[PDB]
Write a protein that binds this ligand. Sequence first.
Ligand code: BCL
Ligand code: BCL
Ligand SMILES: CC[C@H]1c2cc3[nH]c4c(c3C)C(=O)[C@H](C(=O)OC)c4c3nc(cc4[nH]c(cc(n2)[C@@H]1C)c(C(C)=O)c4C)[C@@H](C)[C@@H]3CCC(=O)OC/C=C(/C)CCC[C@H](C)CCC[C@H](C)CCCC(C)C
Ligand SMILES: CC[C@H]1c2cc3[nH]c4c(c3C)C(=O)[C@H](C(=O)OC)c4c3nc(cc4[nH]c(cc(n2)[C@@H]1C)c(C(C)=O)c4C)[C@@H](C)[C@@H]3CCC(=O)OC/C=C(\C)CCC[C@H](C)CCC[C@H](C)CCCC(C)C
Ligand SMILES: CC(C)=CCC/C(C)=C\CC/C(C)=C\CC/C(C)=C\CC/C(C)=C/CC/C(C)=C/CC/C(C)=C/CC/C(C)=C/CC1=C(C)C(=O)c2ccccc2C1=O
Ligand SMILES: CCCCCCCCCCCCCCCC(=O)OC[C@H](COP(=O)(O)OCCN)OC(=O)CCCCCCCCCCCCCCC
Ligand SMILES: COC(C)(C)C/C=C/C(C)=C/C=C/C(C)=C/C=C/C(C)=C/C=C\C=C(C)\C=C\C=C(C)\C=C\C=C(C)\C=C\CC(C)(C)OC
Ligand code: HEC
Ligand SMILES: CCCCCCCCCCCC[N+](C)(C)[O-]
Ligand SMILES: [Ca+2]
Ligand SMILES: [Ca+2]
Ligand SMILES: [Fe+3]
Ligand SMILES: [Mg+2]
Lengths: 56, 58, 56, 57, 280, 318, 311, 255
Amino acid sequence: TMNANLYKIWLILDPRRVLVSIVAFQIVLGLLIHMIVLSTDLNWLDDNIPVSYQAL
Amino acid sequence: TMNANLYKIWLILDPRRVLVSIVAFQIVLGLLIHMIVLSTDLNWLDDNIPVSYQALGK
Amino acid sequence: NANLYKIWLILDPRRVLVSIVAFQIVLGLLIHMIVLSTDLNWLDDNIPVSYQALGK
Amino acid sequence: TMNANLYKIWLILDPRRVLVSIVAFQIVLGLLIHMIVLSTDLNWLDDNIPVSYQALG
Amino acid sequence: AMLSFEKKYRVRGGTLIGGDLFDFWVGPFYVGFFGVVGFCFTLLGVLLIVWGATIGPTGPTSDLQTYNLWRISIAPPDLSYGLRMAPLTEGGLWQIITICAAGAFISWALREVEICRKLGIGFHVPFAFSFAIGAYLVLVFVRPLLMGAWGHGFPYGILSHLDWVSNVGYQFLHFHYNPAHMLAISFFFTNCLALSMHGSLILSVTNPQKGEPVKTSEHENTFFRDIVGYSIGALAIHRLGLFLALSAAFWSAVCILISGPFWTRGWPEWWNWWLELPLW
Amino acid sequence: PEYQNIFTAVQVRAPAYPGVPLPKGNLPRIGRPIFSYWLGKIGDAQIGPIYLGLTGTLSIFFGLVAISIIGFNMLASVHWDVFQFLKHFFWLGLEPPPPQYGLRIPPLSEGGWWLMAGLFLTLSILLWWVRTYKRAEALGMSQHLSWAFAAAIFFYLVLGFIRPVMMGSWAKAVPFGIFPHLDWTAAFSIRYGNLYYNPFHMLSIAFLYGSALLFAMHGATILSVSRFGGDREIDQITHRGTAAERAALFWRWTMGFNVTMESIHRWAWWCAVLTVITAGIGILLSGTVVDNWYLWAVKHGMAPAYPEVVTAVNPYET
Amino acid sequence: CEGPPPGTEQIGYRGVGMENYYNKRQRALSIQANQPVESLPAADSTGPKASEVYQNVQVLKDLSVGEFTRTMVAVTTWVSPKEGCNYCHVPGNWASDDIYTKVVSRRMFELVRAANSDWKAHVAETGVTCYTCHRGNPVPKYAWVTDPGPKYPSGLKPTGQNYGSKTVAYASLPFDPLTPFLDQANEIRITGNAALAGSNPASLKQAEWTFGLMMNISDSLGVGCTFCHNTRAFNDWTQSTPKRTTAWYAIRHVRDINQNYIWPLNDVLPASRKGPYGDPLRVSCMTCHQAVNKPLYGAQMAKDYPGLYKT
Amino acid sequence: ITHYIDAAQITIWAFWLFFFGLIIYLRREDKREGYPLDSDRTERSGGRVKVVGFPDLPDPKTFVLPHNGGTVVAPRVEAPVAVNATPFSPAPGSPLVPNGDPMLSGFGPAASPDRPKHCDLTFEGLPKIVPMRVAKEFSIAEGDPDPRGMTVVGLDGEVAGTVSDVWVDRSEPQIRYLEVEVAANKKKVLLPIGFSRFDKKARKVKVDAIKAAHFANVPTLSNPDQVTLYEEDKVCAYYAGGKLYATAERAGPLL
Ligand code: BCL
Ligand code: BCL
Ligand SMILES: CC[C@H]1c2cc3[nH]c4c(c3C)C(=O)[C@H](C(=O)OC)c4c3nc(cc4[nH]c(cc(n2)[C@@H]1C)c(C(C)=O)c4C)[C@@H](C)[C@@H]3CCC(=O)OC/C=C(/C)CCC[C@H](C)CCC[C@H](C)CCCC(C)C
Ligand SMILES: CC[C@H]1c2cc3[nH]c4c(c3C)C(=O)[C@H](C(=O)OC)c4c3nc(cc4[nH]c(cc(n2)[C@@H]1C)c(C(C)=O)c4C)[C@@H](C)[C@@H]3CCC(=O)OC/C=C(\C)CCC[C@H](C)CCC[C@H](C)CCCC(C)C
Ligand SMILES: CC(C)=CCC/C(C)=C\CC/C(C)=C\CC/C(C)=C\CC/C(C)=C/CC/C(C)=C/CC/C(C)=C/CC/C(C)=C/CC1=C(C)C(=O)c2ccccc2C1=O
Ligand SMILES: CCCCCCCCCCCCCCCC(=O)OC[C@H](COP(=O)(O)OCCN)OC(=O)CCCCCCCCCCCCCCC
Ligand SMILES: COC(C)(C)C/C=C/C(C)=C/C=C/C(C)=C/C=C/C(C)=C/C=C\C=C(C)\C=C\C=C(C)\C=C\C=C(C)\C=C\CC(C)(C)OC
Ligand code: HEC
Ligand SMILES: CCCCCCCCCCCC[N+](C)(C)[O-]
Ligand SMILES: [Ca+2]
Ligand SMILES: [Ca+2]
Ligand SMILES: [Fe+3]
Ligand SMILES: [Mg+2]
């Protein structure tokens, strides 16, 4: 359920600082989530899938 | 049962600083709880469920 | 007390509210942390079951 | 779906700072991804493909 | 000789002790009562150092006597002498030189006070010099007294006192974890950073790029706001530098004062109060 | 009694200064300046604005990546447990790669993160150097700050890059962590036979002590003449006042000689800079040239000798 | 925080700074907590030897029946006083070896006899009894197993350091020096014997592993580094104390105990005596010394028990 | 192969060569003010012998002042200025004694050079240090008392006057002087903040340097709306003379 005067938030919160903060937060969060996933069993870089590429 | 004049809280506390604080606080809390849960038996990433994806390759 | 309401003539209502909110959030974090450091820990207690055991 | 008045973002965000921040962010990202991949099985410099050059001597 | 602007400041009086008796200069140096008193302590102490080098630890004929500048060492007495005066050849020489040194230092500081009185300037410099003296006295007086022997002092030798520092430090296994020592070092490092920043800034605005006039107070403030978003101010950088240097000396004295008198186990283990808090 | 000029008793306010105008090519400054009453007790109350072009934006991006990689690895080393991260924070670290990998890029799971943090912190610092250089250039000022910063960067580079490369191993570089980098400091002296006997260590100490000596002297000297406006060193340098005359005479009468208001800042500059020049040289020579500083000092005749009151039979001899 | 004055002792030459400091009140309470149990009255040393009176005596062969009974009484108080004789014995059959505690105890007798007769370069004439380690408990309080450290996620290899650990006296140094140095025999030396570079390949990380072992040793004996070293030259035996020579033999003694006495008993020890890596609880400096420079402040217990010596 | 010379030894010797060169550089810079020295050797030589010590003086550098303010050179030939004092003893190294009333002698801690007769300027070129009457954009920081209207007391607690204004630094906002309307003569004189303690609850400024009656002779400003470097030094030096001169006890000694 949403509200009809929700657009009035931009009379309250500066559009420029809000947009900047969003993209800075999302970029950092995406770096963080890839780091977490790489540190776990879900790692897709060192999993030797489809093959291991390090030859003897 | 809350008061009828509770809206008058926005005559006292700045709605802008409150909204920014709630947003900032909630994000940090969200990051914190996810980490606390990952540190325990409830961990859903290194539990090898449904399968272990490293086992496939090793 | 009947004249307790006069405390707001002495102490800034706004700062008391903010201080109450800040202290209660920190206390809440502290008490959960303390309780989790002990036998009462409900997250790592393998109850109802160990999910790491499930994955083995 | 894009927006027909999207061009108005440059009435909001300064074009110079946006350009500078994109250049900076992409330089760091490019270096970071190459180093991350070089630290894994995908490394293409120390894989002895097509040959090992340290074994020739 | 005098600086070309100096004669109009060479005024009579402002002494603490002595008055007209010793109220005179010798070349550049102001003398006064504490100049005379300090001179005697100083000349005696230095000559007893040279005498100690001359006879060495076991007499002038032994292979241990040396005038090698790095190897000369005048050492304190055995701990068994406690708070008594040892024989001159068994550490008593070190004890007399120590009293000479303290008197030379304190006389130097009081001479500085008399000079401030002549010049009508604040007393910040003798006040600040007192922190270095205080640290020296913690090392040879307060800490030895609390442990019960003057022999806890450090030896007077260019390299031999580094051996003392090493062996006192490793008595606590890993001295780096001393909390007052960490704080003092932070002040020493921060002071060195701040000094290089301050020296650089004054020289860069009074010696600007070729073709430029001398720069302004507005340039100084603008320059660090541009780099770090803050400028402390031209008066306050001198407040800050004094605060950091005195804090470095103060927390130094604290960190050796607690090492023995107020703590005897390894320094890492002190941090177990933190690890053992019932929070984690 | 007297005013010591340590704290400002009565602050005044004026509209925030936006800064000296910069030449074309510099970007506009950013931030709306604010005032802090409590900062105004000890110094300037204004915070901001700040300059941020391409050099600094790139510097900050590299530096945040480096810092986040360190913190991430610290938290991972206590299995994501934020409470244990706070408990063990001073002990946690990001560890240099194992010796088996030499100078090769090591695996992500065992040293790759250290190598990336060192690379990205280093680029962040080098770009910060360019920033200090550019900020002086835009104001028409000489480059004294960037030269001194370069001397500190030299030492930093010797610790983590030059010496490890010369010695053939990233495992010989410094860990990122509070107590871990103190372990490294003590272990380095142990491994190389007691850093007290390194003559460039001795010099670096002389200059670190000397820096505190000189700022105590100069800081106190200037406050004692701030009653004559001596803190305004630009105009005391161009137009010698009784502040500068009394400062020099205090020292001439005390110790027989003195400097000038300008040249004390040269003494200070070199003392601080020589602290890190000699420090870099001292570490640069350890392992590469001298393997045991104590035995180097014995060889050159410097180590004190003592009466033998303890001694131990060598069981490797027996 | 502690209060002055500390107890002090001079170790080296005046001014060299080799000095020990200790807390007097903690020392007095430690002495009370490290009391040795009074020796049993002397027994009759005559009559037939245990070798010819009992059915399955393999170690204590040459004791008289009196000395043998006395020995059994003594080890019961030292090891299993709450449980009594049958902690090591099948009810109704003293000769039976069908209980793991008896098999372990037989080898423990050989351990003690080997220490007291063959390792005097370490334990001198003071020697050891069962009490030195067990202190009246079947499981010695200060035995150790290989420490896995904190959990890491599966994609990051544990470093073995950078953690607040009592084992290295709360430094962030490598926190398990026991496994590589007091069980296995890794090289402890890293200091060069020549001024100039060219012949010492030892590393800074090896220095840190050695430093970690030295923290553990110091903490186990309740001493500082200068108890054994002049720290201007840690390697230089000519400037070290005689305690360093003793400590050298003690390291080799402990290795012998773990490699030759504890580890071969692993299969007969229950799973409750093993660490997460399957290794048995075993011996370090702390197990005997228990934070004192000499176990039990040097109390001479073993000399009153002839069965604790070889032949 | 073995050699006594090694690279560590080579490098440390190279450092000493650099360091002694650096010291000589620095000592030359140190001699850009106050040299050659005023000696009695230059007097008797008829000026033939200039006392400069070692190293000798550097060649002069130039400071180019902003806003076409001129050029300052260092070192520079500076004219001797008479000393308003007489030697206590004729022996060399003896102090001198101020002529007349010590407060007014311009000698000892009352002394100061003659700085230039123009004002220090803001970057934009306005007089830097000015009263709040002139720089109306300035205010008192909220939380701190307004010094205007406070009563100024001398070292003996007697009322010297009232603060009539506050003089601020327009370049780096801070109080540099209080303006005191002196009760005795109704003149308005500067009082440096460096000689001022605030008694905030009493709204009093305490001045330890001089007595209340000494405020009558604080040096005066040529222009009431600005202050020249020259006048700044004359003002500050007059208060400082009081530290030694304002009472008899201040001469010392204690014992
Ligand atoms: C086993 C444990 C569970 C799990 C149990 C939960 C539970 C329980 C909750 C979350 C919540 C969240 N989880 Mg989780 N979560 C898991 C694994 C993940 C993983 C991962 C890589 O494995 C990711 C990235 C996420 C991410 C998230 C976020 C989307 C969300 C918290 C956002 C926040 O703090 O807003 C703070 C910001 C504000 C308050 C500002 C205002 C909000 C704005 C306007 C809206 C932002 C987008 C919004 C959150 C979209 C939510 C859509 C879906 C419901 C996810 N979870 C697993 C599988 N997760 C929380 C949530 O759903 O909130 C609704 C929550 O209650
Ligand atoms: C293994 C050995 C230990 C160690 C053992 C200790 C011990 C033990 C001590 C220190 C002390 C110090 N250590 Mg530590 N310390 C170690 C490693 C470090 C490291 C590092 C990078 O690893 C650093 C930065 C430090 C830093 C410090 C300082 C905080 C402090 C020294 C400054 C001081 O006392 O000023 C104070 C200044 C003085 C005392 C000088 C006094 C000067 C006097 C008044 C005037 C002299 C005039 C002179 C004679 C004039 C000559 C005239 C000329 C001839 C003309 N240590 C290690 C890990 N450390 C010391 C301390 O705190 O002392 C108080 C101390 O005792
Ligand atoms: C003379 C030798 C000494 C010295 C000199 C020296 N150091 C220097 C300089 C000089 C001359 C500089 O010019 C430079 C400087 O700029 O100082 C002000 C620097 C410096 N010395 C520094 C530190 C330092 N120096 C040290 C030492 C020393 N410096 C010596 C003792 C020490 C020690 C003793 O260990 C340290 C810790 C820095 C303050 C600065 C170099 C800064 C730098 O390179 O920054 C880039 C690196 C980063 C990690 C950038 C990270 C960004 C931050 C995390 C800010 C985040 C901003 C972000 C936008 C926040 C957004 C959050 C939102 C929620 C709002
Ligand atoms: C408190 C912050 C720092 C500080 C500040 C400080 N020091 C100061 C001052 C101030 C404000 C002065 O005003 C005063 C001065 O005049 O400097 C030019 C002084 C000073 N600090 C000095 C030295 C110095 N300060 C040091 C440290 C510090 N000083 C701090 C870190 C050190 C260190 C760190 O080791 C030393 C070596 C002198 C340059 C000067 C004091 C000069 C003085 O007192 O002269 C009288 C004494 C002699 C001329 C020699 C006396 C000889 C003795 C009688 C015999 C020698 C005994 C001695 C104990 C042997 C030591 C042997 C071995 C340790 C090698
Ligand atoms: C050679 C010979 C005589 C041998 C005989 C030996 C024997 C037997 C006896 C001699 C010993 C005796 C009895 C006396 C010697 C003591 C005497 C008289 C003099 C020594 C004095 C002394 C302590 C000198 C040490 C000087 C040192 C090294 C100081 C270190 C600090 C340092 C590097 C200072 C240099 C920079 C200076 C001068 C800073 C001061 C200074 C500061 C700090 C400003 O802020 C400032 C602001 C504006 C203008 C000027 C200044 C200014 O000059
Ligand atoms: C181990 C080997 C030795 C190690 C020593 C390393 C020293 C270098 C490391 C530090 C780098 C500093 C970079 C900045 C330099 C600087 O900034 O100098 C420039 C500034 C001048 O600029 P300004 O302000 O006048 O005007 C700014 C407008 N451009 O200052 C100086 O002129 C200092 C003077 C230099 C020092 C002279 C030393 C001479 C030694 C002679 C030895 C003779 C012996 C002969 C034996 C045969
Ligand atoms: C979870 O955390 C979040 C994300 C919330 C953020 C928190 C972060 C935190 C808490 C971080 C804490 C950091 C701390 C405490 C750091 C302490 C650091 C210390 C004390 C460091 C001290 C010294 C380190 C040094 C000197 C390291 C130097 C390394 C260097 C110079 C490496 C250079 C490497 C290079 C140039 C590599 C090049 C790669 C090549 C080209 C060779 O590739 C083949
Ligand atoms: C474990 C710590 C023991 C306790 C407690 C007691 N005994 Fe023991 N006993 C133990 C061992 C290892 C051995 C074998 C010794 C050897 O030299 O091989 C024994 C042996 C005996 C015997 C000899 C039985 C036989 O072979 O005929 C007897 C009679 C005996 N023990 C008696 C005994 C008594 C009376 C005890 C309690 C006081 C007692 N034992 C305790 C190990 C341990
Ligand atoms: C100013 C630095 C001069 C350094 C000169 C040394 C060059 C070769 C160094 C390698 C080692 C030399 N040596 C003799 C110690 O073997
Ligand atoms: Ca893959
Ligand atoms: Ca390839
Ligand atoms: Fe300055
Ligand atoms: Mg480590």
